[PDB]
Structure 1
Amino acid sequence: WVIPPISCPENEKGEFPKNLVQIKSTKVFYSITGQGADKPPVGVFIIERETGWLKVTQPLDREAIAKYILYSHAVSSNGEAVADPMEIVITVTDQNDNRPEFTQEVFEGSVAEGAVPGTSVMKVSATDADDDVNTYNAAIAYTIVSQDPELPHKNMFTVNRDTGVISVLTSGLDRESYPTYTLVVQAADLQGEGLSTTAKAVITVKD
């Protein structure tokens, strides 16, 4: 045989089917087997019997299947396999089509009112379904969007953009005055420059 590495981007558009590669091996008839061919999901990839042109029949979702393993078969017209089945690996390449997702809707934390600026309070966390191995499409930066109340100061807390750890930023926390803060926290991919989602951190001020 001879089998090149094969790639298809997810979320393609336009006319289908789309040509991938021509598989070459008495007239020969080409077949593919495997999950994605004759097994679920059935018919995502096909091959032309006579030409050996391997094709994709629909847009792909990498977050469903990121890698397909198929086998090509070559059968003469008289009915004999003229070659061993050849392993074909198709790599589905990533597009940034998933926003980060916070693991909780409302994270809860507490802080001692006398805690010095720079004191760690709590941690927020988010996942991103996109390709964190080969891309930055899942590279999350955390930021604080808003603080309620805006008292005594507007920015009482800060979040570490890599780790999602929230710390005391400035002085002035006081249980008697404002016992609770609701922060809107954001997670944004492409290292903060990309798609984003929000959630809340509720911080209660202790003695």
Structure 2
Amino acid sequence: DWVIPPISCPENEKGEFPKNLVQIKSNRDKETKVFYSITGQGADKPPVGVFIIERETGWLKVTQPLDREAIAKYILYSHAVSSNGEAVEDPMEIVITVTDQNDNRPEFTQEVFEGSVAEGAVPGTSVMKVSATDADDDVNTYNAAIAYTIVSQDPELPHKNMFTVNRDTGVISVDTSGLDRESYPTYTLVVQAADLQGEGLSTTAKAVITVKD
């Protein structure tokens, strides 16, 4: 039973429906009459009706917007039957992949993350980890590929950039030194998560670092 190269249909389509994807067709339709149908989840089983097939020509259509983040791949079967009811083909297994769009913003595991460092640790010691998630397609695109930046430090002394964040790991480390509890005892960092490798959709959270003796 052949399985068909995947038919791509992007999520969140808009406008008039139904829309044509792709024609599936027996080359025996000059020998005898051929009537097409499809079965499976997305066709005659839940969700019913997302895809339909023009009985007579074999144009496969989609009848509504899709959401990759709810169903990413549909498997159906097509059938080719003649007037006398005989099968003109074995069923063909039909694979449809929902193609991703970047329609989910990253989200931080917490709105405020807490750590602490020692006064005289050392430019590149580990303070804490911040983390986001993105629900988009981490396998075939960058839409869920998260770059952590630092947006602002408070207060800005002794110098701006007392800290850095590793843009992939979200691990926060000491960048320059002169950390002095008694001059400046807590810092409030605004941290950013952005997909498209830094360029895309973004969100912010807070990291509150307590300077210790």
Query: 1:5 deviation in Å?
Result: 3.0
Query: 1:3 deviation in Å?
Result: 3.8
Query: 1:99 deviation in Å?
Result: 1.4
Query: Over the residues paired in the alignment, what is the CA RMSD in angstroms?
Result: 1.8
Query: 1:27 deviation in Å?
Result: 2.5
Query: 1:29 deviation in Å?
Result: 2.2
Q: 1:2 to 1:118 in 2, by over 3 A?
A: closer
Query: 1:19 deviation in Å?
Result: 0.7
SS in 2 for 1:79: coil
Range that drifts further, 79-88 or 38-47: 79-88
On the 8 A contact 1:28/1:76 being kept in 2, the answer is: yes
TM-score w.r.t. the length of structure 2 is 0.89
5 Å-filtered alignment, 1:2-151, equals: 3-25=4-26, 26-151=32-157
SS in 2 for 1:191: helix
SS in 1 for 2:197: coil
Query: 1:107 deviation in Å?
Result: 1.5
- The separation in 1 between residues aligned to 2:46 and 2:172, in whole angstroms, is 45
TM-score w.r.t. the length of structure 1 is 0.92
Query: 1:4 deviation in Å?
Result: 4.3
Which residue, 181, 190, 199 being the options, matches 1:193?
Answer: 199
Gaps of 5+ in 1: none
* Pairs aligned (count): 207
On the 8 A contact 1:145/1:186 being kept in 2, the answer is: yes
Map Cα deviations across residues 168-188 of structure 1 (whole Å, 9 max, x no partner). Answer: 112222222332222111011
Task: Tell me what 2:29 maps to.
Answer: none
Map Cα deviations across residues 74-108 of structure 1 (whole Å, 9 max, x no partner). Answer: 23334443332210011111111111121222221
Q: 1:181 to 1:96 in 2, by over 3 A?
A: same
On the 8 A contact 1:3/1:23 being kept in 2, the answer is: no
Map Cα deviations across residues 21-44 of structure 1 (whole Å, 9 max, x no partner). Answer: 111124322221111112222211
Range that drifts further, 86-95 or 75-84: 75-84
Map Cα deviations across residues 134-169 of structure 1 (whole Å, 9 max, x no partner). Answer: 111111111011122223322211111111111111
